[PDB]
Design an enzyme around this catalytic site. Structure first.
Site, PDB file in Angstrom:
ATOM      1  N   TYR C 120       0.839  -1.228   0.000  1.00 30.35           N
ATOM      2  CA  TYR C 120       0.000   0.000   0.000  1.00 30.35           C
ATOM      3  C   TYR C 120       0.870   1.273   0.000  1.00 30.35           C
ATOM      4  O   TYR C 120       0.381   2.341  -0.344  1.00 30.35           O
ATOM      5  CB  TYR C 120      -1.043  -0.133   1.107  1.00 30.35           C
ATOM      6  CG  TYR C 120      -2.152  -1.095   0.776  1.00 30.35           C
ATOM      7  CD1 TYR C 120      -3.085  -0.803  -0.223  1.00 30.35           C
ATOM      8  CD2 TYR C 120      -2.287  -2.291   1.456  1.00 30.35           C
ATOM      9  CE1 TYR C 120      -4.125  -1.672  -0.539  1.00 30.35           C
ATOM     10  CE2 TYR C 120      -3.326  -3.165   1.169  1.00 30.35           C
ATOM     11  CZ  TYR C 120      -4.234  -2.865   0.159  1.00 30.35           C
ATOM     12  OH  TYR C 120      -5.250  -3.722  -0.116  1.00 30.35           O
ATOM     13  N   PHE C 392     -10.122  -3.359  10.845  1.00 28.02           N
ATOM     14  CA  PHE C 392     -11.253  -3.307   9.895  1.00 28.02           C
ATOM     15  C   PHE C 392     -10.693  -3.674   8.528  1.00 28.02           C
ATOM     16  O   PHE C 392     -11.535  -3.971   7.686  1.00 28.02           O
ATOM     17  CB  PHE C 392     -11.952  -1.944   9.963  1.00 28.02           C
ATOM     18  CG  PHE C 392     -11.082  -0.787   9.562  1.00 28.02           C
ATOM     19  CD1 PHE C 392     -10.898  -0.460   8.228  1.00 28.02           C
ATOM     20  CD2 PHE C 392     -10.441  -0.039  10.530  1.00 28.02           C
ATOM     21  CE1 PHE C 392     -10.051   0.576   7.878  1.00 28.02           C
ATOM     22  CE2 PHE C 392      -9.615   1.011  10.171  1.00 28.02           C
ATOM     23  CZ  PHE C 392      -9.417   1.313   8.848  1.00 28.02           C
TER      24      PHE C 392
HETATM   25  O1  LIG Z   1     -15.268  -9.094   8.520  1.00 27.38           O
HETATM   26  C1  LIG Z   1     -15.176  -7.918   7.805  1.00 27.38           C
HETATM   27  C2  LIG Z   1     -16.386  -7.889   6.860  1.00 27.38           C
HETATM   28  C3  LIG Z   1     -17.139  -9.026   6.734  1.00 27.38           C
HETATM   29  C4  LIG Z   1     -18.247  -9.027   5.866  1.00 27.38           C
HETATM   30  C5  LIG Z   1     -19.097 -10.286   5.680  1.00 27.38           C
HETATM   31  F1  LIG Z   1     -18.236 -11.250   5.220  1.00 27.38           F
HETATM   32  F2  LIG Z   1     -19.696 -10.557   6.869  1.00 27.38           F
HETATM   33  F3  LIG Z   1     -20.108 -10.169   4.768  1.00 27.38           F
HETATM   34  N1  LIG Z   1     -18.584  -7.919   5.172  1.00 27.38           N
HETATM   35  C6  LIG Z   1     -17.836  -6.775   5.287  1.00 27.38           C
HETATM   36  C7  LIG Z   1     -18.243  -5.662   4.517  1.00 27.38           C
HETATM   37  C8  LIG Z   1     -19.452  -5.792   3.616  1.00 27.38           C
HETATM   38  F4  LIG Z   1     -19.169  -6.634   2.612  1.00 27.38           F
HETATM   39  F5  LIG Z   1     -19.752  -4.607   3.082  1.00 27.38           F
HETATM   40  F6  LIG Z   1     -20.534  -6.228   4.282  1.00 27.38           F
HETATM   41  C9  LIG Z   1     -17.511  -4.489   4.608  1.00 27.38           C
HETATM   42  C10 LIG Z   1     -16.389  -4.415   5.457  1.00 27.38           C
HETATM   43  C11 LIG Z   1     -16.000  -5.503   6.211  1.00 27.38           C
HETATM   44  C12 LIG Z   1     -16.742  -6.725   6.117  1.00 27.38           C
HETATM   45  C13 LIG Z   1     -13.837  -7.920   7.046  1.00 27.38           C
HETATM   46  C14 LIG Z   1     -13.529  -9.285   6.418  1.00 27.38           C
HETATM   47  C15 LIG Z   1     -12.109  -9.398   5.917  1.00 27.38           C
HETATM   48  C16 LIG Z   1     -11.145  -8.245   6.033  1.00 27.38           C
HETATM   49  C17 LIG Z   1     -11.346  -7.455   7.337  1.00 27.38           C
HETATM   50  N2  LIG Z   1     -12.731  -7.486   7.945  1.00 27.38           N
END
Ligand SMILES: O[C@H](c1cc(C(F)(F)F)nc2c(C(F)(F)F)cccc12)[C@@H]1CCCCN1
Ligand SMILES: O[C@H](c1cc(C(F)(F)F)nc2c(C(F)(F)F)cccc12)[C@@H]1CCCCN1
Ligand SMILES: O[C@H](c1cc(C(F)(F)F)nc2c(C(F)(F)F)cccc12)[C@@H]1CCCCN1
Ligand SMILES: O[C@H](c1cc(C(F)(F)F)nc2c(C(F)(F)F)cccc12)[C@@H]1CCCCN1
Lengths: 392, 392, 392, 392
Positions: C120, C392
């Site tokens: 990055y 996050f």
């Molecule tokens: O668990 C977080 C996350 C999960 C999921 C899920 F898989 F539940 F649909 N959606 C996420 C989303 C989403 F896809 F918009 F719902 C945004 C940001 C983090 C998310 C992420 C996953 C991998 C990288 C860091 N946190």
């Protein structure tokens, strides 16, 4: 494939087989030392025709048994079969010839240290002492309020106090079952091994009390581990004093020692669990050569009242055995056997390391009388717990 | 900071402290089971004001001691101090109150399993049994020619033979020092733990003989290791038969069991060394609540002749102790003490696991008479080796 | 190979690529939660034609920077390229489009957590916080005589005190550089992960003080290790009280926490070395979207006297930068640059984690004036040490 | 148990206790070397009566502190208590006598390297430098486009360039806080350790630049690990050039170095994470002997404006402390203290390794003024990051 006493010309072939068979093996300088302990007809070799493919010998030793009685003991050592000659019955033939010579020479017992646990049982040897490794996490070790010596101990160079170690060891061997006379030549070797080796062991130090000593060194790879090579204490006070000093090795995390199951060390501490058992193995093995001479020679517990039985050793004779006032009389009989066991089982019971009841549960000792079993157990027990003197 | 018997409203706070203190902890379904064993005033809690910051209780148990005598035994368990309230004397205050209640209730002994080895000595508890782990490299294991049973054993599902295990265990506990009555609710829990858990333990199988059983399971991570959770054998024949079957687990490399120091297993094999001691630790701890009632209750070895001495327990009374024909009489006296020891030392000697001479060497037992020491040793010895029933 | 905002029909293809790309990945129940944080045009997908082969999005976050100033922050997350489409410039194209949208939307900063350290930097992101794991051997830990609180801490179930954790966390994030607003949906997820999972993590417990909390659990494989998932303390007294309680987890050998380099924990103990640094890594990465808005927004150290310079960011503008009374004014200029650095270097210096002098030694920051460097160092330093809020 | 300056007859007893106490210990050939650094009354021994059971000494050293000011420094070393004489107050008595002699001799500071972290705090010593081990996976390491030197470095035998190392090291020690004058005899010892030892370390090589050097060797057991024993660079260009050469050790997987927290190495690479922190520990410990002489001697940051306070050191005096234009004036006063701290805390803050605010959070430094704390922090900070010269 002939079996003979070696000639001078055989010895280089023997040292070659030694180097290839034994990893502890220094070379023919410790050979001058140990050779003195070997009597005139104490060695056999097997030649193919024609190089040495097998060898075995015994040393003249003195072994303390219960009652502070010292027995002439034939110590088997330097036993090796060439890797080219396995499964040819060489070990069996060498052991049969040495046993014939030992028996004829008048030794009541033979002894050895076993490289593996499955070999010597079939030749009449039973494990007779137990090696018990304790590892102490000395950072947590606090002595109990009851522990003696709440210093009479000095930190010394081993080489400068040989005479005091010799004198303390002599007193220890005479009073402890398992004790062996340590001759001058084995003290020479002990101090050799006590000096630092380039790419080998670190220097040894000693803790010296009037009535005990400990030899220790820091481990090669582990600099937080001190290994006690040997601790000989004639009194409880000496043993506790020496352990107070070892627990004072403040730069160490762990102290390890090869001791015996009845080592009081754990009871000296507020937390008995700090003395962890990290390893257990057979020490000295005994073969009773002459059952009546061995059984008569040792002391028995005075607490058990006079009793009489008939002991059969499998291919070793049957005997009227009377035990009372801590003495045994052991005489030939054709009366019915009340106890049967192989020769190895008797060696295991001789120094008090193994209970007759435990061997009876495995069917190594057979009787239809549970009272006679309790009586054997109590009589063969040792007041002074059996220890291991030194490997040979 | 008040100390009381819990009310119904206290129990959720207790289960919270339990979950945080104990890793074995299932949840309040095993609570129905164990709660029945707790008598009406068998529990104390400490409140801050106001949540539970400390708890302790005892269970009504039945402990077999030498001579096949069964004692009412107060089993301390579920002992916990909140991590927020360490060094406030809570454990000391909870133990003092439970001991008062146990003594007043008429229990001659209390018992516990210790999470650490440095805590309970100062409260009068001595380690009284020894856990001995053997690991067998079963690929090399051959039974000795003398070994019984050269099949009466069946491979079964534990849940389908509950009644036979119950009956074999009942016979075992009555005849073995260390034996505990196992109530219905602890059999319910044993079979719960015997079924496979998703991401937990594998299924348990049983080997069932008329006079013995073994419960075993393959290890989670190691699929070449079978762990024997429990082997109860009433006869030597059963013990050997069960071990023949365990050595027949041909897909396994190693069999491990937590047993006792006198397990005959090693003697069943041609190589005794194959039964390696991988771990040793204190099992059951005993606190003698009433010295005369405990000393009179147990059997002593018949081999030692009648003798009389004076035993002082530190802050526990002084007693004329006469031992003969395997019975003790223990009466008050102000005559001079010949033996002194703390209460914990007596608990360590009660089941025969520890010799008086070993404790005397550590100065935990004090006498100026070595003959009296040999007599104590022989008298307190146990014909039947002491074993560990089950953790609580 | 087209790049668009996803439609509802794209989301299953995105969750598939998520499952294959991310090991932490639960499934589309945490998707309801995190989706609320994603604004209307906050996501891009790459289709081949035609399935999803690439995705990236940002969340609306609130980041505390020095001076207790809270910035709207675009948090990049859920970034993935299909393993079938590597080396096609998908990541570069997705980052360029999101950065365009973030800049146009008026965000002064973007942020992310990096799966690898080499990606990055080339997109303008600099590591801005430092994760520091301390492992405490709690068996040796004694609090210093000077340590506060020589209890106001309770052991509680997380689920029963959600409101108090929420309130303590809110106070912590506002006062600490690195702090992030934690929305309801991320508290829902935190408590989900706090309950025991069959074949997964053990139950979590909480230590609750009026001005701090710690969430901890025993490790799955290691039952002597407690992992602190999160400790938030608003006062020094709370931090010390919580650590007194964690050191009271008497059944544990080790306590581990992911904290920051300035955690005072080591100074609370008599032996500072007991708090071992077992792991260090970049936490939050920052990309300054608008240099003047970011530099004007944060507070600077009051200790450094007023100074003026010219800062050039490589392809990011050149600015007259005046810093005094803890405030910056940052205005366009074509005057000669006195300081040059890439955009990533400014993000690394923004929260005070990295000194300008250290970056200058690596030639990431360039100046011919060592006095200006000391002035930058002191001005960009943070009174309150920078910490990492949550991944996050 | 008497405490004296050693006589010639005491030295063999001292070398014995040295061999038993120190694992690094060569033998009395490095004794000629280090003895020259010990002044006439710089050593104490404790005799029992009568052998040496305790020893301690100091060396005459020259320590660079912030502002490139060089202080006469008493370096405590060769500190040992016999394992037979622990808990007798020997260390406390030896430290009290040496401190008396050091203070009377006119040393403003004493210093040591600590075998354990819990000992020397109570004697007024605070950890003053931080050892930081970086392990680089050099197979992935690419230099950043901004990194200098995109060769002026030669691969050489250490023994053939002693003079150039001596000259580069001298320049480094004068300009860096933590720097120590390295006398001829410690260069003799450095080159001794640089040659291969049979069953010990592999040969050392050097990378030589006009303005820096690195000494490295391949690890004994690990042949894919190169250990940098020492890298001294006077310029950023030298540091980068030397690291370009170390990353060119193409047969190695990993390069490890014990450096300082502000080592710019990570910033030279495209992936900062490749420079992993594998280990952190206290380096040099400082005891301020004379508070006013130490505080007046060092330079302070020019960025912080003139301020005045009252500092109390616990049992060390109270002082009016005025700091401005990078200089301190430190005069006796009985006015009310605004800052209190123990002597060890001042040593920790002296070289700028530890922030006053971090110590204040642990309550090691006490003030009711947060502005004064920010002022202390900025004033005691070091422009040039503090490094560790060499162990003694
Ligand atoms: O668990 C977080 C996350 C999960 C999921 C899920 F898989 F539940 F649909 N959606 C996420 C989303 C989403 F896809 F918009 F719902 C945004 C940001 C983090 C998310 C992420 C996953 C991998 C990288 C860091 N946190
Ligand atoms: O070290 C002991 C030993 C060594 C040597 C030596 F190799 F020095 F010539 N000779 C031994 C002899 C000797 F061959 F008679 F000299 C007898 C008994 C033990 C000996 C043995 C060697 C392996 C088995 C146990 N101790
Ligand atoms: O599992 C045993 C046990 C569990 C539970 C349970 F958690 F199910 F409610 N309750 C126990 C009780 C109970 F609390 F009275 F129910 C007493 C004794 C042992 C108990 C304990 C737990 C930790 C220490 C040794 N066995
Ligand atoms: O190697 C250093 C050292 C060695 C020796 C030697 F063992 F060669 F005689 N003497 C030292 C002395 C000396 F005893 F005065 F000679 C002082 C300081 C350090 C010495 C020490 C040894 C252990 C602790 C740190 N460095």
């Amino acid at each position: 494939v002939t079996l003979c006493s070696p000639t001078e010309d055989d010895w280089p072939g023997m040292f070659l087989l030694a180097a290839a068979s034994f990893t502890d093996f220094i070379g023919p300088e410790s050979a001058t030392a140990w050779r003195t302990l070997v009597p005139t007809d104490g060695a056999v070799v097997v030649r193919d025709g024609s190089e040495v493919v097998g060898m075995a010998l015994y040393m003249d030793l003195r072994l303390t048994v219960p009652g502070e009685v010292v027995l002439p003991t034939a110590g088997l050592s330097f036993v090796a079969v060439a890797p080219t000659h396995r499964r040819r019955g060489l070990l069996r033939a060498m052991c049969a010839e040495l046993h014939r010579r030992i028996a004829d020479s008048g030794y009541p017992v033979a002894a050895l240290h076993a490289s593996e646990g499955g070999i010597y049982g079939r030749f009449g040897y039973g494990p007779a002492t137990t090696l018990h490794e304790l590892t102490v996490d000395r950072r947590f070790a606090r002595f109990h309020a009851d522990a003696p010596g709440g210093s009479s101990v000095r930190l010394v160079r081993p080489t400068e106090h040989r005479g005091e170690f010799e004198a303390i060891y002599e007193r220890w061997r005479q009073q402890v079952p398992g004790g062996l006379l340590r001759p001058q030549v084995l003290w020479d070797e002990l101090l050799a091994e006590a000096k630092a080796a380039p790419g080998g062991d670190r220097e040894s130090f000693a803790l010296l009390h009037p009535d005990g000593y400990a030899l220790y060194r820091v481990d090669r790879t582990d600099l937080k581990l001190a290994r006690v090579s040997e601790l000989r204490a004639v009194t409880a006070d000496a043993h506790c004093a020496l352990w107070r000093a070892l627990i004072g090795l403040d730069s160490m995390e762990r102290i390890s020692i090869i001791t015996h199951p009845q080592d009081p060390l754990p009871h000296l501490l507020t937390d008995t669990r700090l003395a962890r058992t990290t390893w257990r193995q057979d020490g000295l093995w005994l073969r009773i050569m002459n059952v009546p001479a061995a059984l008569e020679a040792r002391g028995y517990a005075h607490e058990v009242g006079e009793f009489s039985t008939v002991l059969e050793v499998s291919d070793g004779g049957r005997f009227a055995l009377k035990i009372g006032d801590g003495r045994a009389r052991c005489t030939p009989t054709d009366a019915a056997a009340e106890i049967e066991m192989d020769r190895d089982v008797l060696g295991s019971l001789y120094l008090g390391a193994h209970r007759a009841s435990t061997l009876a549960a495995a069917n190594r000792l057979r009787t239809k009388d549970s009272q006679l079993l309790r009586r054997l157990d109590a009589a063969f027990a040792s007041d002074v717990p059996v220890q291991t003197a030194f490997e040979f």
